[PDB]
RNA sequence: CGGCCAACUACGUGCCAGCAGCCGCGGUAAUACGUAGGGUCCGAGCGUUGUCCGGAAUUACUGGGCGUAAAGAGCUCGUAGGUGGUUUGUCGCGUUGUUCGUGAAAACUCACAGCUUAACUGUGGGCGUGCGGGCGAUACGGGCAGACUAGAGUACUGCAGGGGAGACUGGAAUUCCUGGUGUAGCGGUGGAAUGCGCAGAUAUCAGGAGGAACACCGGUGGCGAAGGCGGGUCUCUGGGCAGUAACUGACGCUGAGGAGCGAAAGCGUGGGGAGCGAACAGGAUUAGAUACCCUGGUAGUCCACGCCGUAAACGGUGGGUACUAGGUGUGGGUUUCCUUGGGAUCCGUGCCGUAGCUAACGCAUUAAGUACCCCGCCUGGGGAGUACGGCCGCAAGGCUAAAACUCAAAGGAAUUGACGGGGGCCCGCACAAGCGGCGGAGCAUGUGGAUUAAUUCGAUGCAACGCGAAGAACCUUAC
RNA sequence: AGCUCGUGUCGUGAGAUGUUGGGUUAAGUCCCGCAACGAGCGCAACCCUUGUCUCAUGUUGCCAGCACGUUAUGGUGGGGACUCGUGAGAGACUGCCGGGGUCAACUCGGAGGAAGGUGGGGAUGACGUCAAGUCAUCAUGCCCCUUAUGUCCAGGGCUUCACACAUGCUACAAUGGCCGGUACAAAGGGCUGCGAUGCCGUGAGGUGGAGCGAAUCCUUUCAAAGCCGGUCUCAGUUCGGAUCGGGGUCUGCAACUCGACCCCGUGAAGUCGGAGUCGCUAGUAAUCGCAGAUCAGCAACGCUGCGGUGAAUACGUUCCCG
């Protein structure tokens, strides 16, 4: 319908960096398999925690798993108790040893993935969806410094039978411009009536910064 | 040059064009011309060209005025209806084909002659300067 | 208009002066056919006013319901309208017409209550009246009966204004019962006002 | 315990069983069906059905309407009726003031008393909106008796006009006829064919007959009450307008029923019959034309004498009257000024435009504006301007005019779209200009269908069918 | 090439206006007007590749000027000159001149230049449509199975066939077939992989392992159509290869149902294809090979790419289609 390519996959050569970074000849399928099982292992407890980014640098078979989140304090509970448990399970599930770096984003309302987190987690919690969309926005535009704001919510909105898509915005979100620095995040709400897939586009600025 | 529809009743939008015109002239005293692409420089030459050639008085206004002086109530009908709508009194020149009920404090006369019209402009401009002297 | 009860840890709800009385009369989704389907928008007929007897009439167009209500609030805010009274009644029987809206607004003795249909009941409950007797003849609508009621309140005038138009010393303009009601209403204005000063 | 309309959740059946006052709820996640919890509203009751008033300004006296929504008789003349300019007098019938009589009791309303309270009952007022008698008033309506000239009508001087009827006559054109000249086609169409020709057509020239219609002037123009009216001339006759004010002195307006006029088609009797032409043939088109298009063609169209009475008889706007900014055309006529030009005026007919009005479009001194007088007419859509009955008619038919029943609408104006074998302007291998193919042959793949124990499952206009498969011997793999 | 919104105005209202008008554009591109003034998502631009040069640049790549090879060639000492490889940079902007333009946008010609006017091609799909597709990629609400609708294995099927459609490939021959000699690519692929010289076969291939995780080694120094030569003489043929028989090789536990390839024979339909219909406007069409992914093997004539040789025509919007 809207045949819109994932813009983090449309600027992954130009502005947005890769999330996983190594070099691999004849070891690549194994590094893919470990990358997948690591991201499944970091889905659940960190999606409780407020995860945004999961980068995996990979040096000579050590591993370096780095996570950008919005609360160091739920990811790091008691020191080593909440960190070294998921870290140690990453050390056992992989056949390797894990150096887990955990870091905070300076503004959670600035990331499109975390905006999709807070919106969809509100939308599972029986709030008004137009009220939710408005809440995430306006406040986000000011927060740090955003130029774009696109929030599309499809699915059983309000528990209705029809799957109505909604489309709210503010400012400038140019997708066809490649010097855009757009963050994109889709996260899917889980109501009892079903799943409300939320897409958030956030246009930070014109800046190439090449 | 041309009466833009909605200057008085809509001041909150046409004031933004003025601050953009200030940022344009303040980036003309800056001197950034060669560092940008010349299509954008000629485009800002069109923005300063049209926006300065068509907007000269509200550059000094800022302040949603208390009185409006109108030449030719017939042709500039938009200014007289907008000026009536806010409650601002209307001072005008009225030929034989102008409705005097829309103008509170008229000065009747021909507007087609530059001597007569321009002389009445001298009347009320000297009147405003006479207001400025004792203030 | 749902999910309004909320507590926010944000900057401000911006509650401030002019706590006026605001009534939303009707909302009908307004559709528009375009190429490939229908575009639903929303109209909210907003009545605002204070209990003195100043009335607004606003008409909100937006594709969200509280957005249309807020735009009707700002539009009636832009356009107020003074209604003359006697005590908390109306002066004299009028009929207003807004092109099909007929409304008869007749005064009554106090204590009777605002008897009117829901649009006229909205415009009169926001206003400074408590005891009048109206009826909405024709047009069976909300917009035309609100706008017809406001035209009916434009056909109102003071007893004093009438005396002034005719250059006659009051007494000589009213009859006497209505002058006595002026004495009663200004007397209770004096009692509640001087209880307001202390 | 959807919405109105105070009051919601689960289970059970999933276009069934049922619900419902209307809108409408039931197609395996119903707050609308059935049961449960729970809530709401009433309470010795609470729901249903029926009948009436209300809401219904929806028969509108108070208190509605008629350009297009239902609704202005086709148009006039006029009987009863309704309505009436200016002014003096008189009567006191309408109107009004006041007093008397009466409007039984009960009820109703106000106060009070009585029953433990209340309903209930009683006492005393008011109500009894009216009617009759006496006395008073005279502005307004009316009656009578008068007076007036602005409305109305008449006389006089002009003026414009397809107003009407009768009579006589004019030319161009079409058709036929006789006679020339003269040959093989003419006619007709989107393209053709029936058709007329080769026996002398069409073509052209001369003459003759006969009928009808009036080119140009001639149009947003004139006249008529409306239909309607244009070759000319003559005869008879109708209305209008202006000017003077000579006369009469309110004689005005409207008009239920009523009489008269009333396009076209049609009807009767008698004429006439060129062109056009229903019906009626043939031809063509087409699936099929009982149609459009073609060739022929009778009633009719024409005149005389009568019928009939209908129309989008339309300005979709009844008639009269007074008033309410203007601007510009054109038709008829009077006058002041420049000296034909403008001014002013009375009557007419158009275009634009304020105020005001209207649902909107629009109207807007030629009102759909502001008011008065009289008439017609409307009361949801169908059923139906139909039946029954009567009246008129030679007939066709017209006029007058229902009910059962049924529907939850049928309508008016404007808005956004889509659409058009509507208009304009544009583009694309869209056509044209080319080149190479597919459709026929053999095979390779995929699908339909039929098979099968199984032929796993999906994808069927463009946008499914060398597609999910970037690899079916076993594995894959679902059968 | 459009789709909207904010604020103002217009309207009782749905709504309008803006976004219509005059001109211009590949384009709501852009100017000039106009009760509108602005913004936003699109269009353009930013990015990749192709076209020219400059600077940097020397092995595994080039070889001019040098030296040495003799057999076989940059083969080897050597060299930055030419390529080429990949980094940075310049360069196309109606910038420069002539004419139309309302002295505005823009359009017709000229110069310079490798390139001229979005140079060529990509990547890039606005608001929405179609209850389009997919509960079999995955995730999933609800309903169903739980002694089977789970799961394990052998065998079979997904390949059946009187048919009908659809996309392709090989053809119907002389611009051709067959034999001999000979010249020129681009890109790619490679670990329990790619596998050379040599030897055994007619040939699939066998034996063997040089050498390479690869600008080096291997895919031969890479092609085929091309060119030179000979033969065939218009024919159901020296065209055409379907089919069928015999004989093999390789992969795999296993080629029966059901693999590909080679050898010998066999030698059918088919003589340019009715109604119709499809693709394509320049390195395009047409034709010629090459590589890749999937993969032990292959139904590959498929798909994705790479290069070779290379045309015709466009008068122009009447007609069909959007």
CATH code of the domain containing A28: 3.30.300.20
Instruction: Decide if A42 is inside a domain.
Output: yes
Burial of C15-53, coded b for 16+ CB within 10 Å and e otherwise, reads eeeeebebbbbebeeeeeeeeeeeeeebbbbbbbbbeeb
Beta strands in chain A (DSSP E): 20-21, 51-57, 64-69, 99-104, 150-153, 166-169, 182-190, 195-203
Question: Domains in chain A: how many in total?
Answer: 2
Please state, in angstroms and rounded to a whole number, the distance separating the CA atoms of residues A164 and A114.
23
Same domain, A87 and A181: no
Q: What is the length of chain B?
A: 135
Q: Which two tokens stand for residue A50?
A: 């407020």
Residue A42 contacts residue A94 (beta carbons within 8 Å): no
Minimum CA–CA partner of A130 in chain C: C64
8-state DSSP, A156: S
Same domain, A91 and A142: no
Please state, in angstroms and rounded to a whole number, the distance separating the CA atoms of residues B118 and A161.
72
- Between chain A and chain C, the number of residue pairs with CB atoms below 8 A apart is 6
Residue C105 contacts residue C149 (beta carbons within 8 Å): yes
C3 and A139 in contact by Cβ < 8 A? no
Instruction: Report CA(C60)–C1'(E70) in Å, whole number.
Output: 101
Please state, in angstroms and rounded to a whole number, the distance separating the CA atoms of residues B98 and B93.
9
Q: Which two tokens stand for residue A163?
A: 């799957």
Burial of A163-195, coded b for 16+ CB within 10 Å and e otherwise, reads eeeeebebeebebeeeebbbbbbebebebeeee
Specify the pairing of strand A99-104 against strand A64-69: parallel
Contacts of residue C152, Cβ cutoff 8 Å, sequence gap at least 6: C94, C95, C96, C103, C104, C105
Where a domain ends, among A106, A123, A150? Answer: A106
Q: What is the length of chain C?
A: 198
Same domain, A92 and A151: no
Q: Which residue is it, tokens 């410094």?
A: A145
Beta strands in B2-133 (DSSP E): 68-70, 90-94, 105-108
Q: Which residue is it, tokens 């909302």?
A: C27
Strand pairing partners for C42? C29, C62
Instruction: Report CA(A168)–C1'(D352) in Å, whole number.
Output: 50
Residue C95 contacts residue C101 (beta carbons within 8 Å): no
A130 and C64 in contact by Cβ < 8 A? yes
Whether A127 and chain C come into contact, CB under 8 Å, resolves to yes
Q: In angstroms, what CA-CA distances link B11 with A68, B3, B7, B18, C121? A: 46, 14, 6, 11, 36
By C1' distance from the Cα of C35, the closest nucleotide is D417
Which residues of chain C (3-42) touch nucleic strand D at CB < 7 A?
A: 32-35
Same domain, A144 and A60: no
Instruction: Decide if A53 is inside a domain.
Output: yes
By C1' distance from the Cα of C67, the closest nucleotide is E6
Please state, in angstroms and rounded to a whole number, the distance separating the CA atoms of residues B128 and A81.
81
Mutation for C interface: A1, A123, A126, A128, most C CBs within 10 A: A128
Same domain, A72 and A162: no
Whether A142 and chain C come into contact, CB under 8 Å, resolves to no
Q: Which two tokens stand for residue C118?
A: 């829901």
Q: Which two tokens stand for residue A55?
A: 């980068």
Chain centroid, CA C89 distance in Å? 13
Please state, in angstroms and rounded to a whole number, the distance separating the CA atoms of residues C112 and C134.
12
| Residue A171 Cβ under 7 A from any strand E atom | yes
Residue C96 contacts residue C103 (beta carbons within 8 Å): yes
In this structure, is the dihedral angle defined by the CA atoms of residues A104, A108, A110 and A112, taken in order, positive or negative?
positive
Residue C86 contacts residue C179 (beta carbons within 8 Å): no
Helix axis angle for C118-126 and C143-154, nearest 10°, is 50
Residue B17, domain CATH: 1.10.287.610
Maximum C-alpha span of chain C: 69
Residue A137 contacts residue A151 (beta carbons within 8 Å): yes
Q: Which two tokens stand for residue A192?
A: 């009892």
A128 and C2 in contact by Cβ < 8 A? yes
Q: Give the other-Cβ count within 10 Å of A50's Cβ.
A: 21
What residues in chain C have their Cβ under 8 A from chain A's Cβ atoms?
2-3, 10, 64
Same domain, A140 and A186: yes
Angle at C108 between CA C104 and CA C113, to 5 degrees: 90
Please state, in angstroms and rounded to a whole number, the distance separating the CA atoms of residues C145 and C77.
20
**Range(s) of the domain holding residue A192:** 107-209
Same domain, A59 and A152: no
Q: Taking the CA atoms of chain B, what radius of gyration do you get in angstroms? A: 19
Residue B82 contacts residue B6 (beta carbons within 8 Å): yes
CA distance C64 to chain A (A): 9
Residue A123 contacts residue A196 (beta carbons within 8 Å): yes
| Residue A14 Cβ under 7 A from any strand E atom | yes
Residue A176, domain CATH: 3.30.1140.32
For A6-15, which contacts have Cβ atoms below 8 Å and span 24 or more sequence positions?
Answer: A6/A184, A7/A175, A7/A180, A7/A182, A7/A184, A7/A201, A8/A182, A8/A183, A8/A184, A10/A175, A10/A178, A11/A178, A11/A180, A11/A182, A14/A178, A14/A179, A15/A178, A15/A179, A15/A180, A15/A181, A15/A208, A15/A209
**Range(s) of the domain holding residue B34:** 4-55
Please state, in angstroms and rounded to a whole number, the distance separating the CA atoms of residues A46 and B123.
79
Q: In angstroms, what CA-CA distances link A98 with A43, A91, A197, B56? A: 17, 5, 33, 68
A131 and C64 in contact by Cβ < 8 A? no
Q: Which two tokens stand for residue A197?
A: 């897939």
Specify the pairing of strand A51-57 against strand A20-21: parallel
- Phi first, then psi: what are they for C51, rounded to 5°? -75, 5
Chain C contact set for A162 (CB, 8 A):
none
Please state, in angstroms and rounded to a whole number, the distance separating the CA atoms of residues A73 and A71.
6
Q: Which two tokens stand for residue C65?
A: 């319901």
Please state, in angstroms and rounded to a whole number, the distance separating the CA atoms of residues A152 and A168.
7
Q: Which two tokens stand for residue B20?
A: 């953009």
Residue C151 contacts residue C159 (beta carbons within 8 Å): no
Specify the pairing of strand B105-108 against strand B90-94: parallel
- Give the residue from C18, C19, C65 showing the smallest Cα distance to C46: C65
Please state, in angstroms and rounded to a whole number, the distance separating the CA atoms of residues C125 and C25.
12
CA distance C42 to chain A (A): 15
Same domain, A118 and A188: yes
CA dihedral A107, A111, A114, A118 (to 10 degrees): 80
Instruction: Decide if A89 is inside a domain.
Output: yes
Beta strands in B4-134 (DSSP E): 68-70, 90-94, 105-108
Where a domain ends, among A48, A75, A106? Answer: A106
Please state, in angstroms and rounded to a whole number, the distance separating the CA atoms of residues C76 and C132.
23
* DSSP string over C52-87: TTEEEEEEEEESSHHHHHHHHHHHHHH-EEE---SS
Q: List the determination method.
A: cryo-EM
Angle at B114 between CA B108 and CA B117, to 5 degrees: 25
Instruction: Decide if A136 is inside a domain.
Output: yes
| H or E, element range at C24 | strand C21-34
Helix axis angle for B14-26 and B38-53, nearest 10°, is 130
Contacts of residue A190, Cβ cutoff 8 Å, sequence gap at least 6: A120, A124
8-state DSSP, C18: -
Instruction: Decide if A51 is inside a domain.
Output: yes
Strand pairing partners for A103? A68
Q: Give the other-Cβ count within 10 Å of C143's Cβ.
A: 18
Q: Taking the CA atoms of chain C, what radius of gyration do you get in angstroms? A: 20
Chain A contact set for C10 (CB, 8 A):
139
Q: In angstroms, what CA-CA distances link C21 with A38, A172, C53, C125? A: 59, 38, 11, 9
Q: Which residue is it, tokens 């509650």?
A: C15
The side-by-side arrangement of strands in the sheet containing C101-107 is C94-98, C101-107, C132-137
Instruction: Report CA(A188)–C1'(D383) in Å, whole number.
Output: 62
Instruction: Decide if A5 is inside a domain.
Output: no
Instruction: Decide if A11 is inside a domain.
Output: no
Instruction: Report CA(A23)–C1'(D451) in Å, whole number.
Output: 56
Q: Which two tokens stand for residue B75?
A: 């042709």
Where a domain ends, among A106, A129, A152? Answer: A106
| Residue A28 Cβ under 7 A from any strand E atom | no
Same domain, A200 and A118: yes
Instruction: Report CA(C184)–C1'(D78) in Å, whole number.
Output: 67
Contacts of residue A110, Cβ cutoff 8 Å, sequence gap at least 6: A140, A143, A144, A145, A146, A183, A202, A204
Angle at A158 between CA A156 and CA A160, to 5 degrees: 55
Q: Which two tokens stand for residue C45?
A: 């007929």
Q: Which two tokens stand for residue A108?
A: 């959670």
Same domain, A77 and A128: no
Contacting subunits of C (3+ beta carbon pairs below 8 A):
A
Please state, in angstroms and rounded to a whole number, the distance separating the CA atoms of residues A180 and A7.
10
Please state, in angstroms and rounded to a whole number, the distance separating the CA atoms of residues A103 and A69.
6
Please state, in angstroms and rounded to a whole number, the distance separating the CA atoms of residues C104 and A113.
60
Residue B135 contacts residue B128 (beta carbons within 8 Å): no
| H or E, element range at C182 | helix C176-197
Secondary structure class of C155 (helix, strand, coil): coil
Whether A130 and chain C come into contact, CB under 8 Å, resolves to yes
Q: Taking the CA atoms of chain A, what radius of gyration do you get in angstroms? A: 18
Q: Give the other-Cβ count within 10 Å of B126's Cβ.
A: 10
The side-by-side arrangement of strands in the sheet containing B105-108 is B68-70, B90-94, B105-108
Instruction: Report CA(C36)–C1'(D439) in Å, whole number.
Output: 39
Same domain, A150 and A178: yes
Please state, in angstroms and rounded to a whole number, the distance separating the CA atoms of residues A151 and A155.
13
CA distance C18 to chain A (A): 26
Secondary structure class of A200 (helix, strand, coil): strand
Same domain, A116 and A174: yes
By C1' distance from the Cα of C117, the closest nucleotide is D55
Q: Which residue is it, tokens 């006697």?
A: C86
Secondary structure class of A142 (helix, strand, coil): helix
């Amino acid at each position: 319908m809207g045949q819109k390519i994932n813009p983090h996959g449309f600027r992954l050569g130009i502005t947005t960096e890769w999330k996983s970074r190594w070099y691999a000849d004849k070891q690549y399928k194994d590094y893919v398999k470990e990358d997948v099982a690591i991201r499944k292992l970091l889905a659940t407890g960190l999606e409780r925690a407020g995860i945004a980014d999961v980068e995996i640098e990979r040096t000579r078979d050590r591993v370096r798993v780095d996570i950008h989140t919005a609360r160091p304090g739920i990811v790091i509970g008691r020191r080593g108790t909440e960190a070294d448990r998921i870290r140690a399970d990453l050390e056992k599930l992989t056949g390797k040893q894990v150096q887990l770096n955990i870091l905070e984003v300076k503004n959670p309302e600035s990331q499109a993935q975390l905006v999709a987190q807070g919106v969809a987690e509100q939308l599972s919690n029986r709030v008004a969806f137009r009220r939710a969309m408005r809440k995430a926005i306006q406040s986000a535009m000011r927060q740090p410094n955003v130029k774009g704001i696109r929030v599309q919510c499809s699915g059983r909105l309000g528990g209705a039978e029809m799957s109505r898509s909604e489309f709210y915005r503010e400012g400038r979100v140019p997708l066809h411009t490649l010097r855009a620095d757009i963050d994109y995040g889709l996260y899917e709400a889980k109501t009892t009536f079903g799943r409300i897939g939320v897409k958030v586009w956030i246009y930070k600025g014109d800046i190439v910064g090449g | 040059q041309r009466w833009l529809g909605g200057m008085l009743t809509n001041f909150s939008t046409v004031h933004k064009r003025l601050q953009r015109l200030k940022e344009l002239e303040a980036m003309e005293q800056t001197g950034g011309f060669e560092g940008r692409t010349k299509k954008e420089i000629l485009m800002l030459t069109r923005e300063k060209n049209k926006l300065e050639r068509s907007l000269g008085g509200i550059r000094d206004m800022q302040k949603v005025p208390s009185a409006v002086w109108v030449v030719d109530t017939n042709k500039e009908h938009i200014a007289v209806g907008e000026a009536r709508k806010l409650g601002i009194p209307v001072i005008a020149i009225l030929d034989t084909n102008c409705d005097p009920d829309v103008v509170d404090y008229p000065i009747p006369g021909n507007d087609d002659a530059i001597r007569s019209a321009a002389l009445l402009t001298k009347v009320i401009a000297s009147a405003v300067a006479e207001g400025l002297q004792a203030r | 208009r749902g999910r309004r009860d909320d507590r926010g840890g944000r900057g401000r709800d911006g509650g401030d002066k002019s706590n006026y009385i605001e009534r939303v009369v009707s909302i009908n989704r307004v559709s528009k056919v375009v190429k490939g389907g229908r575009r639903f928008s929303f109209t909210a007929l907003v009545i605002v006013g204070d209990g003195k007897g100043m009335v607004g009439v606003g008409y909100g167009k937006a594709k969200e319901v509280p957005a249309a209500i807020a735009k009707g609030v700002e539009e009636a805010r832009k356009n107020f309208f003074r209604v003359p009274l006697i005590g908390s009644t109306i002066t004299h029987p009028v009929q207003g017409e807004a092109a099909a809206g007929v409304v008869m607004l007749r005064p009554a003795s106090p204590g009777t209550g605002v008897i009117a249909g829901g649009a006229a009941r909205a415009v009169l409950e926001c206003a400074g009246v408590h005891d009048i007797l109206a009826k909405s003849l024709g047009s069976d609508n909300a917009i035309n009966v609100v706008h017809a009621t406001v035209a009916a309140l434009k056909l109102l005038q003071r007893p004093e204004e009438v005396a002034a138009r005719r250059g006659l010393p009051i007494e000589d303009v009213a009859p006497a019962g209505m002058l006595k009601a002026r004495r009663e209403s200004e007397a209770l204005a004096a009692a509640a006002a001087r209880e307001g000063s202390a």
